[PDB]
Design a protein around this ligand. Structure first.
Ligand SMILES: Cc1cccc(CC(=O)NCc2cc(O)n3nc(C4CCOCC4)cc3n2)c1
Ligand SMILES: Cc1cccc(CC(=O)NCc2cc(O)n3nc(C4CCOCC4)cc3n2)c1
Lengths: 193, 193
């Protein structure tokens, strides 16, 4: 456990500086102060190490969103959506290396693709349930199917946050991405059509 | 040229059935009715073949959008945005195998990442110029910076169309994705805040 956490911290450090393809099991064992065979006790592969790093970051974001859902919802509609989107901005934004490599690996790894898909379904279904509540209370108009709207807005957040964090071209500057997403969620949820 | 087009058609056919990683230069030469060394005359690699397939599809979408921009803009604002988004829905939707492999390769290939980035900058800048025109004429309110709004809506279309075409979970059904994107573009462009 000592040593497991030591391997994980070494992988997150090395991913800040190069891809997983460029990090060797030997690099990971060296950093964690264990032998290579001792590494293979804790993790079947460097790929299994990334999968565990991603699982921790995804669960941290999920647990923060549940925390927010526990307490009452803000009496200001725009602020209620900003606070929830900010959970993802801060959590993944605090773990950009893990995030970047995580997204790369989804094309590679069925396990990584499956983890990402399970969490996105959970977050889309929660988004859809809040839009349905807003429509029930008379605050939001009955336009698009709620689940479809929730799907597109969640995919937009995924691609846009990732582009900002990786500093891709094109991308919204990190300092502008929360305002930009909140504007699009609010106008599309409350907007008549 | 005969033979180049024959290699390209074979690669698009084989990509419908498996990834590029699972297609051999020998597979491509076999399909096009040439020898392996004759293949290496036309293309340095199977990767170079994908890059050429993607370039043709991207240019087809770009040339269709220029066609639409040539003719006057529809007197119905919602229809003007649907027609333009539909260019991307139909073009990439007619070449799903190339699209799917194209997106996979961006993590792999600097050349593929660079081609995709050049076209997205062009499409975002055109989107931003139409929003600016709409604001100038008094039709759209001056909310978010136009280029930032254009960036987020274009990234949303990228991730959402690709998820629908690859049938990922989660995804908007292909039969619902155009209505869903148009709703979000229109409410976010014309929506007061
Ligand atoms: C309050 C409230 C009420 C209702 C719903 C929410 C949830 C919310 O608002 N946003 C959800 C959300 C969902 C996602 O699937 N993602 N995915 C990302 C990517 C993760 C890391 O790569 C880049 C971004 C962000 C994100 N956000 C909140
Ligand atoms: C009329 C008018 C006035 C102003 C602007 C437009 C342009 C428009 O409306 N949409 C642009 C647009 C841009 C993109 O960068 N993409 N990227 C995709 C992905 C391509 C293949 O992978 C999945 C989708 C679609 C797309 N669309 C049109």
């Amino acid at each position: 456990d000592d040593r497991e956490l030591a391997i994980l911290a070494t992988a997150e450090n090395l991913l800040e500086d190069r891809p997983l393809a460029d990090i060797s099991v030997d690099d990971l064992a060296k950093g964690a102060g264990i032998s290579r065979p001792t590494f293979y006790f804790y993790f079947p592969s460097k790929e299994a190490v990334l999968l565990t790093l991603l699982d921790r970051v995804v669960n941290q974001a999920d647990m923060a969103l549940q925390t927010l859902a526990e307490n009452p919802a803000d009496t200001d509609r725009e602020n209620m959506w900003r606070t929830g989107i900010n959970v993802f901005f801060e959590t993944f934004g605090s773990h950009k290396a893990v995030t970047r490599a995580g997204q790369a690996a989804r094309a590679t790894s069925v396990e990584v693709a499956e983890l990402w898909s399970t969490f996105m379904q959970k977050w889309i279904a929660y988004t859809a349930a809040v839009i349905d509540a807003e429509r029930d209370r008379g605050a939001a108009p009955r336009t698009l199917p709620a689940h479809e709207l929730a799907t597109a807005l969640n995919l937009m957040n995924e691609r846009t946050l990732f582009a900002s964090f990786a500093g891709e071209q094109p991308s919204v500057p990190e300092a502008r991405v929360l305002d930009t997403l909140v504007h699009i969620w609010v106008t599309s949820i409350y907007g008549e059509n």
